[PDB]
Amino acid sequence: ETLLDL
Amino acid sequence: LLDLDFLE
Amino acid sequence: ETLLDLD
Amino acid sequence: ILPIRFQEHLQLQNLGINPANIGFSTLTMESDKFICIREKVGEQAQVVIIDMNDPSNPIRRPISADSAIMNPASKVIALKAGKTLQIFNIEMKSKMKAHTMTDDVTFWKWISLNTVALVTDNAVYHWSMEGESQPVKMFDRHSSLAGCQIINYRTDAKQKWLLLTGISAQQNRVVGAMQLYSVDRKVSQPIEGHAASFAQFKMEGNAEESTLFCFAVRGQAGGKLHIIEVGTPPTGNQPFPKKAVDVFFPPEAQNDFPVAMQISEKHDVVFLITKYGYIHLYDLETGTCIYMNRISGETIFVTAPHEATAGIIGVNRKGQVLSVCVEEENIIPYITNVLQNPDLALRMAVRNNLAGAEEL
């Protein structure tokens, strides 16, 4: 899905 | 290597 | 084809 | 006292370099060891190779290439003309390698001592110089970079986290588009960003280094710097808590944006340079802004690590070759006394074995 959450 | 002054 | 001439 | 030191190494115009060739497309500096400049003198295209250990004696050789990038450590030079890529060992007068691509290469760079990264309109490849290796595709480009000018490509130390950066004009500003790719997950993430670097950082109380991704962006909301761990922490490690801090632009710099980043793992600090020549220094651990000033009137368009000082070296449009690094005797008393931050001062003093926190 996503690599990073910021 | 020449020391430089900052511009501000 | 030779992209650099070293001679 | 100032926490950074600013040095001029060279003025390229003193070596007879035409200022029209002092620019992103014609001047490359893949490490602090060499500068290559593509020039046309009369009818003949040439490359001028400046050895930074012997700079008053540049060599000039005829070329028929649209781009030349020197290896970071050795006098081994990559050149290309359209789809033709060739690698030469200069001192052996030898064509090491040749490869014919099926797409033009719009951007390339050495990403290690032995690997060249190749960016086409559609994908990114790595090409190892070891043995009989040919280019291997790493990932396909994300549509968010379509039509961008590609300005950078970098990786983490283990080449498992890959980052492509382009820019374009949108709503009358220069907008950054990045593509972060995980080799292990085979997943990309589009991220608005202008300049970035990876770094290894070992948190106190962890047995293993964390791999951090740091990027700076001027977004519609304003400037921000992010420091975030990529990947799953090594077994046993605590995770690195992500940090995010403002990146300041003064009122007269309304069209400025970040253009370069280098991270010193000697001092665990982040150097950021902006398009219109401001230098910022941040703590890698906390993101805290340690220092800002102006180092160039002209844009600094290419940078590299400055190995001896673990700083940053760059060339500006006038052809000044300049470096910035931590002033090891001043940084701690600067943070204690000018920033009034004894907590950061004491941490950095013991973290990187710097003098000055004997008094806080």
Written as one letter, the residue type at D64 is S
Domain extent for D263:
1-360
Closest residue to D7, CB basis, from B3, B7, B8 = B3
Which residues neighbour D172 within 8 Å (Cβ) at sequence distance 6 or greater? none
CA distance linking residue D235 with residue D215, whole number of Å: 26
Phi, psi of D156 (to 5 degrees): -75, 170
Q: Is D42 left (phi over 0), alpha (psi -120 to 50) or beta?
A: left
Q: Are strands D115-119 and D123-128 parallel, antiparallel or unpaired?
A: antiparallel
Which residues neighbour D310 within 8 Å (Cβ) at sequence distance 6 or greater? D264, D265, D266, D267, D325, D326
Burial of D222 (0-12, 13-18, 19+ CB in 10 A): exposed
CA distance linking residue D88 with residue D32, whole number of Å: 20
For chain D, the residues whose C-beta falls within 8 A of a C-beta of chain B are 2, 5-9, 277, 293-297, 322
Contact yes or no for D226 and A1 at CB 8 A: no
CA distance linking residue D51 with residue D183, whole number of Å: 35
DSSP state of D52: T
Contact yes or no for C2 and D95 at CB 8 A: yes
Q: Which two tokens stand for residue D241?
A: 């808590």
CA D295 to chain centre: 17
Give the residue among D127, D119, D183 at the shortest CA–CA distance from D145: D119
Cα D136 to Cα D106, D118, D119, D123, D263, distances in angstroms: 17, 10, 12, 10, 28
CA distance linking residue D158 with residue D307, whole number of Å: 20
CATH number of residue D187's parent domain = 2.130.10.110
* Chain A residue nearest residue D181, CA to CA: A3
Contact yes or no for D61 and C2 at CB 8 A: no
Closest residue to B1, CB basis, from D2, D7, D294 = D7
Asked if D283 and D243 touch (Cβ cutoff 8 Å), the reply is no
CA distance linking residue D311 with residue D307, whole number of Å: 7
Number of domains in chain D: 1
Contact yes or no for C4 and D80 at CB 8 A: no
Phi, psi of D20 (to 5 degrees): -65, -20
- Across D125-152, b (16+ Cβ under 10 Å) vs e yields bbbebeeeeebeebbebbebbeebebbb
Q: DSSP per residue over D9-32, as a string?
A: EEEGGGGT--GGG-STTTEEEEET
Resolution of the determined structure in angstroms stands at 1.7
* Chain B residue nearest residue D6, CA to CA: B4
* Chain D residue nearest residue A2, CA to CA: D189
Written as one letter, the residue type at D146 is A
Q: Which long-range contacts (CB under 8 A, 24 or more apart) does D274-283 make?
A: D274/D249, D275/D174, D275/D299, D277/B7, D277/D316, D278/D249, D278/D253, D279/D4, D279/D6, D279/D324, D280/D247, D280/D248, D281/D3, D281/D4, D281/D326, D282/D225, D282/D245, D283/D344, D283/D348
